Amino acid sequence: NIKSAKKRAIQSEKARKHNASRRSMMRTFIKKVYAAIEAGDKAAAQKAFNEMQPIVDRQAAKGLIHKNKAARHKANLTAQINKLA
Amino acid sequence: ARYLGPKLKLSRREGTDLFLKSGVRAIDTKCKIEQAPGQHGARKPRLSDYGVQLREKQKVRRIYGVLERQFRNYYKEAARLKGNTGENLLALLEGRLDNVVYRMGFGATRAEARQLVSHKAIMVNGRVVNIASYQVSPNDVVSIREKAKKQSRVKAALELAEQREKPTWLEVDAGKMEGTFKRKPERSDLSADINEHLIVELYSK
Amino acid sequence: ATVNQLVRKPRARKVAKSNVPALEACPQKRGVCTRVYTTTPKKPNSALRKVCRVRLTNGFEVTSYIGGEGHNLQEHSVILIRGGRVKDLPGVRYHTVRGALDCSGVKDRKQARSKYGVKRPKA
Amino acid sequence: DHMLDGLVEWAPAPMPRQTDTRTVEASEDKFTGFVFKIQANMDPKHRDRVAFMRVVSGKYEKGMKLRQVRTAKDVVISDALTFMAGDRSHVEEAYPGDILGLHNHGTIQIGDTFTQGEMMKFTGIPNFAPELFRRIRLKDPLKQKQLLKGLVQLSEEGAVQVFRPISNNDLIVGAVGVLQFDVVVARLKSEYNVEAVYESVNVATARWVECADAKKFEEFKRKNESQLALDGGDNLAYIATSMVNLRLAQERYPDVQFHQTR
Amino acid sequence: LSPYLQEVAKRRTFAIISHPDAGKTTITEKVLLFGQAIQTAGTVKGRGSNQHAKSDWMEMEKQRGISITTSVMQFPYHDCLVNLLDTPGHEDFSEDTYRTLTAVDCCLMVIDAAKGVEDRTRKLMEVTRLR
Amino acid sequence: MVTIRLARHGAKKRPFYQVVVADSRNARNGRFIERVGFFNPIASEKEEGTRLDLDRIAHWVGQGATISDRVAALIKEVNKAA
RNA sequence: GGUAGCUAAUACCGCAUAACGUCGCAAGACCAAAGAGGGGGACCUUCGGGCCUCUUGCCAUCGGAUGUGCCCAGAUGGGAUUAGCUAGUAGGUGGGGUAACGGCUCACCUAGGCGACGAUCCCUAGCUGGUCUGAGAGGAUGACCAGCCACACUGGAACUGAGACACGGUCCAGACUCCUACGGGAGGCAGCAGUGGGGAAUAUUGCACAAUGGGCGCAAGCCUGAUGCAGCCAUGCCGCGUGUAUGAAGAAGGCCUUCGGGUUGUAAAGUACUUUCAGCGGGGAGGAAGGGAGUAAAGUUAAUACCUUUGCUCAUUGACGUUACCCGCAGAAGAAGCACCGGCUAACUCCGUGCCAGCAGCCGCGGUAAUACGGAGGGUGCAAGCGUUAAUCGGAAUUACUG
Ligand SMILES: Nc1nc2c(ncn2[C@@H]2O[C@H](COP(=O)(O)OP(=O)(O)NP(=O)(O)O)[C@@H](O)[C@H]2O)c(=O)[nH]1
Ligand SMILES: [Mg+2]
Ligand SMILES: [Mg+2]
Ligand SMILES: [Mg+2]
Ligand SMILES: [Mg+2]
Ligand SMILES: [Mg+2]
Ligand SMILES: [Mg+2]
Ligand SMILES: [Mg+2]
Ligand SMILES: [Mg+2]
Ligand SMILES: [Mg+2]
Ligand SMILES: [Mg+2]
Ligand SMILES: [Mg+2]
Ligand SMILES: [Mg+2]
Ligand SMILES: [Mg+2]
Ligand SMILES: [Mg+2]
Ligand SMILES: [Mg+2]
Ligand SMILES: [Mg+2]
Ligand SMILES: [Mg+2]
Ligand SMILES: [Mg+2]
Ligand SMILES: [Mg+2]
Ligand SMILES: [Mg+2]
Ligand SMILES: [Mg+2]
Ligand SMILES: [Mg+2]
Ligand SMILES: [Mg+2]
Ligand SMILES: [Mg+2]
Ligand SMILES: [Mg+2]
Ligand SMILES: [Mg+2]
Ligand SMILES: [Mg+2]
Ligand SMILES: [Mg+2]
Ligand SMILES: [Mg+2]
Ligand SMILES: [Mg+2]
Ligand SMILES: [Mg+2]
Ligand SMILES: [Mg+2]
Ligand SMILES: [Mg+2]
Numbered sequence A: 001n002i003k004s005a006k007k008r009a010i011q012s013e014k015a016r017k018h019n020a021s022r023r024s025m026m027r028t029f030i031k032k033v034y035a036a037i038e039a040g041d042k043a044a045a046q047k048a049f050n051e052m053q054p055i056v057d058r059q060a061a062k063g064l065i066h067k068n069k070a071a072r073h074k075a076n077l078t079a080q081i082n083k084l085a
Numbered sequence B: 001a002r003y004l005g006p007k008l009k010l011s012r013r014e015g016t017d018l019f020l021k022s023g024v025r026a027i028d029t030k031c032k033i034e035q036a037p038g039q040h041g042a043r044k045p046r047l048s049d050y051g052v053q054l055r056e057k058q059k060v061r062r063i064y065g066v067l068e069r070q071f072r073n074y075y076k077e078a079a080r081l082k083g084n085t086g087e088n089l090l091a092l093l094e095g096r097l098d099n100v101v102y103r104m105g106f107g108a109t110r111a112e113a114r115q116l117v118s119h120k121a122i123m124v125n126g127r128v129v130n131i132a133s134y135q136v137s138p139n140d141v142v143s144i145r146e147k148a149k150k151q152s153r154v155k156a157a158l159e160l161a162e163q164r165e166k167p168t169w170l171e172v173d174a175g176k177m178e179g180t181f182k183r184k185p186e187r188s189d190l191s192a193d194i195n196e197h198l199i200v201e202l203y204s205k
Numbered sequence C: 001a002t003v004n005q006l007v008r009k010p011r012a013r014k015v016a017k018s019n020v021p022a023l024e025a026c027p028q029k030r031g032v033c034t035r036v037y038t039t040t041p042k043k044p045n046s047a048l049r050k051v052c053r054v055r056l057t058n059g060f061e062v063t064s065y066i067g068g069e070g071h072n073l074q075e076h077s078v079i080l081i082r083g084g085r086v087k088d089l090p091g092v093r094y095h096t097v098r099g100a101l102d103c104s105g106v107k108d109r110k111q112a113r114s115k116y117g118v119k120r121p122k123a
Numbered sequence D: 001d002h003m004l005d006g007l008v009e010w011a012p013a014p015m016p017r018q019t020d021t022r023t024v025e026a027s028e029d030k031f032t033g034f035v036f037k038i039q040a041n042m043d044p045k046h047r048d049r050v051a052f053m054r055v056v057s058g059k060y061e062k063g064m065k066l067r068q069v070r071t072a073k074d075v076v077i078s079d080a081l082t083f084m085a086g087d088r089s090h091v092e093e094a095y096p097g098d099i100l101g102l103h104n105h106g107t108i109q110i111g112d113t114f115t116q117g118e119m120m121k122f123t124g125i126p127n128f129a130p131e132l133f134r135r136i137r138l139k140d141p142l143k144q145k146q147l148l149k150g151l152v153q154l155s156e157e158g159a160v161q162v163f164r165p166i167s168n169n170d171l172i173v174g175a176v177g178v179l180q181f182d183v184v185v186a187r188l189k190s191e192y193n194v195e196a197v198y199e200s201v202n203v204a205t206a207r208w209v210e211c212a213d214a215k216k217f218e219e220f221k222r223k224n225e226s227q228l229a230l231d232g233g234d235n236l237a238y239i240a241t242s243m244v245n246l247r248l249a250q251e252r253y254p255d256v257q258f259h260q261t262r
Numbered sequence E: 001l002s003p004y005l006q007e008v009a010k011r012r013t014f015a016i017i018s019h020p021d022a023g024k025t026t027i028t029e030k031v032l033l034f035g036q037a038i039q040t041a042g043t044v045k046g047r048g049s050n051q052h053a054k055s056d057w058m059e060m061e062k063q064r065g066i067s068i069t070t071s072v073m074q075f076p077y078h079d080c081l082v083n084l085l086d087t088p089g090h091e092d093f094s095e096d097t098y099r100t101l102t103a104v105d106c107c108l109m110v111i112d113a114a115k116g117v118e119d120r121t122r123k124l125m126e127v128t129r130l131r
Numbered sequence F: 001m002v003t004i005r006l007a008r009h010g011a012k013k014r015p016f017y018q019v020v021v022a023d024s025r026n027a028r029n030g031r032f033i034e035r036v037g038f039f040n041p042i043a044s045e046k047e048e049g050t051r052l053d054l055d056r057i058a059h060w061v062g063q064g065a066t067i068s069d070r071v072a073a074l075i076k077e078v079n080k081a082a
Numbered sequence G: 001g002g003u004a005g006c007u008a009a010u011a012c013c014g015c016a017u018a019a020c021g022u023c024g025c026a027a028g029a030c031c032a033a034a035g036a037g038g039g040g041g042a043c044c045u046u047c048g049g050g051c052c053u054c055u056u057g058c059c060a061u062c063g064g065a066u067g068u069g070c071c072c073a074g075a076u077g078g079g080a081u082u083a084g085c086u087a088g089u090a091g092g093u094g095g096g097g098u099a100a101c102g103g104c105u106c107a108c109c110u111a112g113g114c115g116a117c118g119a120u121c122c123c124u125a126g127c128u129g130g131u132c133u134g135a136g137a138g139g140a141u142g143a144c145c146a147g148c149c150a151c152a153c154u155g156g157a158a159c160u161g162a163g164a165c166a167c168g169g170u171c172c173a174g175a176c177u178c179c180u181a182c183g184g185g186a187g188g189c190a191g192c193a194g195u196g197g198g199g200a201a202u203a204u205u206g207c208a209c210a211a212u213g214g215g216c217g218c219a220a221g222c223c224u225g226a227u228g229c230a231g232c233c234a235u236g237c238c239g240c241g242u243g244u245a246u247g248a249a250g251a252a253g254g255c256c257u258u259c260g261g262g263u264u265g266u267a268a269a270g271u272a273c274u275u276u277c278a279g280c281g282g283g284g285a286g287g288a289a290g291g292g293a294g295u296a297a298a299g300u301u302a303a304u305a306c307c308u309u310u311g312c313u314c315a316u317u318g319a320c321g322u323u324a325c326c327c328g329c330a331g332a333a334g335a336a337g338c339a340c341c342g343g344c345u346a347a348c349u350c351c352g353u354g355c356c357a358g359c360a361g362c363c364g365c366g367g368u369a370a371u372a373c374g375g376a377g378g379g380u381g382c383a384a385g386c387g388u389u390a391a392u393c394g395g396a397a398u399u400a401c402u403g
């Protein structure tokens, strides 16, 4: 709307895009774990977890899975992966 | 906001000399004082408890030149102020600069006392004062305009001023044409045909 | 009576109703006025009082007095109704303002010309 | 197109206009326009009025400061219309010979000269006096402004002009020639949903609108006040019954014209 | 030939006058398509030449009857910038026309060749020679 | 960001600013944390003209509080320890 | 706008590196970032600038301050001619979720949760500090001012970001409207001002960022209808003037009269006198503080440069603005209206009229001497206002808790 910072729009749009996929891969990774859990392979479970552990802690530092939101994930995961394995 | 009309016409209805034609000779007379304030002035007005109750303050107003909107305010003041609202109200009425003027005889009547204050011809503890309503605190010292001092009018005024009751709360002169307001007028040192429980009574409902 | 009673059903004021409720509770209203007639007062007094039925702005239609002697009002006209009743003509709770909108004030009237809406007759 | 070729080929570039000061060359700088018209302003969302100015000399530029010679008050310009064919347009900056539009708020009249400073006034502009009749008394049984507002808005225009006596009602209008019809029509076009009709009115004059020294006038605004009116624009006027009653009126004397001023 | 005196010299501001129902307003609409302001054209009263294209008689009542008050126009033709007026025909009705002449440096009179010279045609020449 | 600025509580022509601690994001005369002195841009040469709880001001600054360019021009215009 | 291609960064992304952080009882796992300026002795190397340095910026962890979330309780309109309300409803366990607790979500499990201390349902309504009234208790109310909340064409949703579910952002739908070369596009004044419309009625399409305050910037500065001013309106509150003195058996004229006179009335005239305020003319505070150019500081430094700092000198910084205010000129000169007068109610007669015309807040006036109608004289009351109407509290102990 005729007001210079309509570029603020196309600007936000670019970010939306960028974030979307970052955030998108974010979860798919965590997924692999839940799968391993509903699947049983505890070796394959820590397997997935270790590869996501960093890739989560990272996006928080970047500012999209903010703060303890990662902690939660890593935590309640570790809490189950060995609750019965 | 000023009266502007037959000054005696008034004194005849209030049935007293309201000091409106002070100037040279005073003490009314030469105007039929009393017996014809109108066309039916002859009449014997047996007036109501209200009648007098009003007529009292309605007098006081005249004998100073104050109007209602302002007078009403004056009353509100005295009531808020601790002590006999009656005398308090008088103390406010006497504290008027127009009054401290005529009172210190720098003018014929209090109708002349204004023409001056209104025309920046007096001052207080220095600075000139134009509002014929200034509230003259204690230690204040009014003084005819150093500029226009002693004139065809004010000169002749001090004349009879000196030959009047002469106050007690103020210390006047004649050459320095300045007085001090030494203290607020007590109840004892002023009066006449003026009742307080009659004017204060009125402002109650 | 009882406090305990008052605690229960607590006392309730009696709301008030204005003698003039052709709305908005506003100083005056404007109306087209549907008829200009005259009628007759209550038992004691007799005359041909001047009144007008008036379609108001708010949709209420209501009769109104025409004070002073003689008026210009008629068929359609537009006036500004005022309030204050007329105890001689019941059902007449309003006075059309003389000297407002389509209303002519009183010809030659010289006293209390404020009401009856007339301008100083050249001092 | 020939007559156009002829138009371009022969017809004058902006010409000098005369003033009570000097021959004003078009070639000069320093802006100098003169109004000449405050068109029958409808107009899609305003009273606008938009006075039409000629531009005799100098270049107009949007933010420039100008001087209304008549009222002797300096005025800054911002919204200054350029009329793309019976249509307001924003807004550019103008050169001699163009036609510019402004925004009348009782400030502009007819023949109001505008300079950048030179106090002088263009000797042109006709401005003549109306004949009469009328009394629009309106169907729509009122309102009342929209009718009146309509009338006190078609009147700072040059065609007609109203007359409202000291009896609130009784609206008189006067009166280009006899086309008192655009009034009725602009009474249900432009921006007023009124209707309005006519009558005959005991008025020959026209009238003529007076003022000068005080006190004397207050004795005049009193004696023959019966009889005296006031216009949209808040002044002044008489309104007479005939010619003899016109002469005697002025003959009360000796305070001023005549005055028409549109 | 500075950018100032050039703009001035290339300008040309004129009237268009005649007796009521001669051709003002029509010749005007046509002058407007020679200036690329109207890509099509029309008639008057929106009449015989169809299409809601009348036009450029400002107002409204004009389009109901026939012409009222001076419309004003600016367009480019050849090497010039024309300022065009549209002066009402009718005795009682204008005024205005006269005051409008005060804004023109020259003037074009339309004449009905089926009528010759009519009344307000003669009266308009008198007003013309004034300047 | 907590700042110490002036609110215009004077009167037409005769202002009367009032130094106060407040979140910057606020209206001039808006939510403030606490008054902390004033400043009379009139007063005339007499008995007074300004006042500051400078020992509170320094408290707030000590908590990361910026100052008005005009608030500053007060603080030190009245010196500090004399 | 669409395809193809080229290019930089404090844009984006790995890697390195990691604890006082995150996960884990521990062991151990895993995460970050940015540079850009003003300069300058060495030496200077591939003499871009590396390097020294101060300045500003980036990361991580723990704090401070502010701001915001979230929770409980009590209180916060009317209606019982509204008596029952509720399936995610009430709780539990378990995943998920959020910044955070939580039914917030879902799964399964108990069958609960609320309600006459008035739920539910209708009607109304932004809440508060306060405001008007009142002796108070209360009643009424919540414009302007400040705090809290909510909405920004109607309905819905998320995105971006510390913070939005976003007045002058985005997407969808709806109603409307505008442009269009017809294929397609565009917009939301409950921001300032302004138009229409409605109404008994509510303002200029004004000036300026000079002051205060906000956003960016190292800074100057830029942006700012916030703000500061102005315009319009007696709408109010508060001031002030329209003249002050003197003046007669007391004019004419008007008014009543039993005609002898009374009264308007010191009122006017006349005589002296004063000029505020307006009108014309001069002089001229404060709102101004800071910034912009040069000089010194055991400031730091390798450095007298740069930067900061504090004093110092110069030029300068306003919208209001023909400012406020001061001083002269002239001359009572330019400025009084409105309601009322039978009673409550201060204040009276003549005439006209005649239960007509008409007044009236209540009682009540008018059918032949109307202090009540209308006019006139006179009188009373307020005064640039006065009146009417409307509305709230009072009087109303007339919803009475006080009572
Ligand atoms: N046959 C014909 N009719 C023409 C021509 N030009 C104009 N007209 C007719 O003249 C009629 C008047 O048209 P218009 O332009 O209004 O004339 P006018 O001179 O503008 N009228 P007015 O004097 O009222 O402004 C038009 O309706 C049109 O039909 C022409 O060249 N030929
Ligand atoms: Mg940008
Ligand atoms: Mg959990
Ligand atoms: Mg007053
Ligand atoms: Mg009503
Ligand atoms: Mg009777
Ligand atoms: Mg009546
Ligand atoms: Mg009846
Ligand atoms: Mg009278
Ligand atoms: Mg035509
Ligand atoms: Mg409640
Ligand atoms: Mg209930
Ligand atoms: Mg509501
Ligand atoms: Mg009580
Ligand atoms: Mg309430
Ligand atoms: Mg409001
Ligand atoms: Mg926004
Ligand atoms: Mg908007
Ligand atoms: Mg607006
Ligand atoms: Mg408006
Ligand atoms: Mg600023
Ligand atoms: Mg801008
Ligand atoms: Mg601006
Ligand atoms: Mg006589
Ligand atoms: Mg003056
Ligand atoms: Mg200054
Ligand atoms: Mg200073
Ligand atoms: Mg500093
Ligand atoms: Mg300047
Ligand atoms: Mg001056
Ligand atoms: Mg008088
Ligand atoms: Mg009264
Ligand atoms: Mg009374
Ligand atoms: Mg009485």
Ligand SMILES: [Mg+2]
Pocket: G359
């Ligand atoms: Mg009466």
Ligand SMILES: [Mg+2]
Pocket: G361
């Ligand atoms: Mg009444």
Ligand SMILES: [Mg+2]
Pocket: G369, G370
């Ligand atoms: Mg009689």
Ligand SMILES: [Mg+2]
Pocket: none
């Ligand atoms: Mg009578």
Ligand SMILES: [Mg+2]
Pocket: G396
């Ligand atoms: Mg009660």
